Amino acid sequence: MTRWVRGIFEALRPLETLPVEGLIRIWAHEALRLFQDRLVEDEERRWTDENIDTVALKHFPNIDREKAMSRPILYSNWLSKDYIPVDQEELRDYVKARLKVFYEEELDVPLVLFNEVLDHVLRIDRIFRQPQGHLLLIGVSGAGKTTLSRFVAWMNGLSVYQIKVHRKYTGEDFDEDLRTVLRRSGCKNEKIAFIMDESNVLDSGFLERMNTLLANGEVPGLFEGDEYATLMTQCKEGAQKEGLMLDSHEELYKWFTSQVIRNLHVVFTMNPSSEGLKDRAATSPALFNRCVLNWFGDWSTEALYQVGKEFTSKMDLEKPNYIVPDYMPVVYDKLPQPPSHREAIVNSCVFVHQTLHQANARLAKRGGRTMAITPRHYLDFINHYANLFHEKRSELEEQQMHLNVGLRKIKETVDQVEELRRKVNRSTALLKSLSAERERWEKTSETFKNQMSTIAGDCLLSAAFIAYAGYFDQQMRQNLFTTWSHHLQQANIQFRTDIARTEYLSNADERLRWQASSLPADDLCTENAIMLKRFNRYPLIIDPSGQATEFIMNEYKDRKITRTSFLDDAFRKNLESALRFGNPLLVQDVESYDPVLNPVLNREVRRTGGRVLITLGDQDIDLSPSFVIFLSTRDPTVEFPPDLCSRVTFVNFTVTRSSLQSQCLNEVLKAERPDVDEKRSDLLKLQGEFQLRLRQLEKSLLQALNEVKGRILDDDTIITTLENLKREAAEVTRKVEETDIVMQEVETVSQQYLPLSTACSSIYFTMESLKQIHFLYQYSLQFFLDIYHNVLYENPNLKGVTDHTQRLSIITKDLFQVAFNRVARGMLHQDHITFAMLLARIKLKGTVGEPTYDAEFQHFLRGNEIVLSAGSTPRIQGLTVEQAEAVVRLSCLPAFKDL
Ligand SMILES: Nc1ncnc2c1ncn2[C@@H]1O[C@H](COP(=O)(O)OP(=O)(O)O)[C@@H](O)[C@H]1O
């Protein structure tokens, strides 16, 4: 209430003749600034707005709507000398005008201005106006709390200062930095907008220093001895050059403290996690005394839609023929009218973001180990969408112009043939072959026109998959992809169905090179390699095994990738040399993440300077363009700080039940029924790879055409190539026309081999969970892989049998038996029955002839623990109390009503 009265009084210093409406407007503005910015939920904010309006009307029942107008009540002293209220649009234009100069100065990164930005900027400016302005910007990473802070601090002419934090950064260094910032604040009279983040704190002593820096503005145990005398020298000089009389030592120190009071603004940016705030309050009470905390909520659907619309402007998404048959909105308010498919693309992007939010909520509800999606992920997703759309359109345009060049070359060949004619059989053969070529190539042209319909949707789905997914397992990746596909089809945005992510995002040669460089054939590994190839945020590999580390080591052997770690004392030494040379650096053990990497991960290198210099620590080091840093770990799952979570692309190699199911299905299809596996590999190659080989034959034909210069005496040299091209075109046509028969029998074969895969996954994860029973029962994935390879390629029972239906049964029985034999051999002779009947339950789930009997198993396991004492008296002489109670509990079971 004191701040309320102070703010109202300040707003009325130079302003006269204000009506009652203006006064209640200022009252409401101050109430919203001091009572609503601190709320965390939107419900609290709207309740505050409703209650302020109802109290205003109750205590002032004879006022005009001049009290409220537009709910964006904003006051700015930028447009006029006084603290006059301003309109949304005028302030937006002025902020854009100032942002032009801001971009000219530094940070050329574009910032789309939404309603939230203008409000946050005005709040931070209001806090900056008062001499004791201190901020606690609590908001999710990527919201731009730091960016807005710097923008407004520059806009008010405040020299921003930041602490460069690393693992070796000691408390004495913090005291020296505080001495420097206070010297700049008091001496030379510099308005410092000194800022910090939660990552900028590694020792509480920082927090007790800020306690006295905020509450009193003077740090007593900072300036001692020589430092104190030097400080008094500089500040006594500053008093003279600022026209201030020199006094005794104590009075001069007091004047310096007052100068720091009026020339220092400390800003805190914090994780919205309230648990951290609970003891942040305890460590420093001044965080709730001198700091006006400003809660930054997650970017709203309005903000996400505006970001998507503004950034996706360079791309050409204008499709004149588009139909909207259903009503699937997200923004709900701006341009809901039938779109030009660009609004549809942006709506799909924001729906993808909401889809991740819903998936995260569901994962947290039905389990844990859930990571939080920051708006920086949206910016990464938008950049991925733009780059991938550019690539996938430029490549098709260049191959289309190649086809046009080939057509013109064939026309020129026709002209040469007409000149030559005026052997006849050779002429007729080449004439019919070239007519067939004309038909095939006009078909190619119409196909090229067809892919323009699907490029937008396919690239959107691929970018949403690569930029967002990567931490989730195979099942959740598939669920997200199918949800995105269903929504995009429902939005009538044309995307090609049955899209192979691996084949669409990579070519044959890169995939085979990956396979050579120690990469498993699992589709999860291929997708992870895809994410590792193209990326904006430097990867953070999650892998319990060492397969990914050795794979990426092999991938960059030529580039001289150096292996270091955070635990290594020479980590900075090993990283500076790699940065200067331009060599990739793989840093393992990200558990003790070094905060010195924040500038590198944020890619905040200042390109404004002549050479591209990064401010890594105190020193400035030039950023080599080939500096590709990598992060990795050795644990399956661990919680990461959210600030680190928003600067890296989580690529996860951790196995799961669905991953084991897919691997076992692929392995059994490779071993049993290799024809279906070959036909599916041909299907995967049908997306681009076969077309790429056809283009290679096309360019070989083009080379031969001017190699022979239209020879007619020896025409077979080109007739062979033409015949091969015709045969390959016919083969591709047969493969495409069989895409209805195929994936109709392929799906049947796959679902036939599904019980084996699910049984394998269940058996492996039961073996993994066997750690609970006894500390000695520890089994690796390699052990189960050996078991499964043995039961496939080494069974003695499969030597003679060849019928697939009998071979599957024999393989399943052999797998069960061999798994039991290999596991029980290292189990005490009291758990053999336990594992055996666990495998029996797994098989009973696998078989279909009888129900699962889940109620019976639940009873047999725990249902006898139900509490009841009615009818517990034995009725027959041949019965006891415990047996009578067991009779009652079994009579509870539906199968035993009459017992
Ligand atoms: N209004 C905005 N529009 C677009 N991008 C924005 C906006 N505000 C911030 N950003 C982006 O946020 C990134 C910086 O986020 P950062 O300041 O590190 O966030 P935080 O302080 O929440 O951790 C940059 O990519 C910047 O362009």
Swiss-Prot record:
Disulfide bonds: none
Residues carrying N6-acetyllysine: 432
Coiled coil region boundaries: 689-752
Residue segments, region AAA 4: 101-370
Cellular localization per UniProt: Cytoplasm, Cytoskeleton
Annotated binding of ATP, by residue: 139-146
Record region (AAA 5): 505-734
Domain of life: Eukaryota
Disease: Charcot-Marie-Tooth disease, axonal, type 2O: An axonal form of Charcot-Marie-Tooth disease, a disorder of the peripheral nervous system, characterized by progressive weakness and atrophy, initially of the peroneal muscles and later of the distal muscles of the arms. Charcot-Marie-Tooth disease is classified in two main groups on the basis of electrophysiologic properties and histopathology: primary peripheral demyelinating neuropathies (designated CMT1 when they are dominantly inherited) and primary peripheral axonal neuropathies (CMT2).
Protein family (similarity comment): Belongs to the dynein heavy chain family.
Assembly and binders: Homodimer. The cytoplasmic dynein 1 complex consists of two catalytic heavy chains (HCs) and a number of non-catalytic subunits presented by intermediate chains (ICs), light intermediate chains (LICs) and light chains (LCs); the composition seems to vary in respect to the IC, LIC and LC composition. The heavy chain homodimer serves as a scaffold for the probable homodimeric assembly of the respective non-catalytic subunits. The ICs and LICs bind directly to the HC dimer and dynein LCs assemble on the IC dimer. Interacts with DYNC1LI1; DYNC1LI1 and DYNC1LI2 bind mutually exclusive to DYNC1H1.
Free-text note on domains in this protein's UniProt record: Dynein heavy chains probably consist of an N-terminal stem (which binds cargo and interacts with other dynein components), and the head or motor domain. The motor contains six tandemly-linked AAA domains in the head, which form a ring. A stalk-like structure (formed by two of the coiled coil domains) protrudes between AAA 4 and AAA 5 and terminates in a microtubule-binding site. A seventh domain may also contribute to this ring; it is not clear whether the N-terminus or the C-terminus forms this extra domain.
Function: Cytoplasmic dynein 1 acts as a motor for the intracellular retrograde motility of vesicles and organelles along microtubules. Dynein has ATPase activity; the force-producing power stroke is thought to occur on release of ADP. Plays a role in mitotic spindle assembly and metaphase plate congression.
Protein's recorded name: Cytoplasmic dynein 1 heavy chain 1
Residues of the full protein shown: 2799 to 3947 of 4646
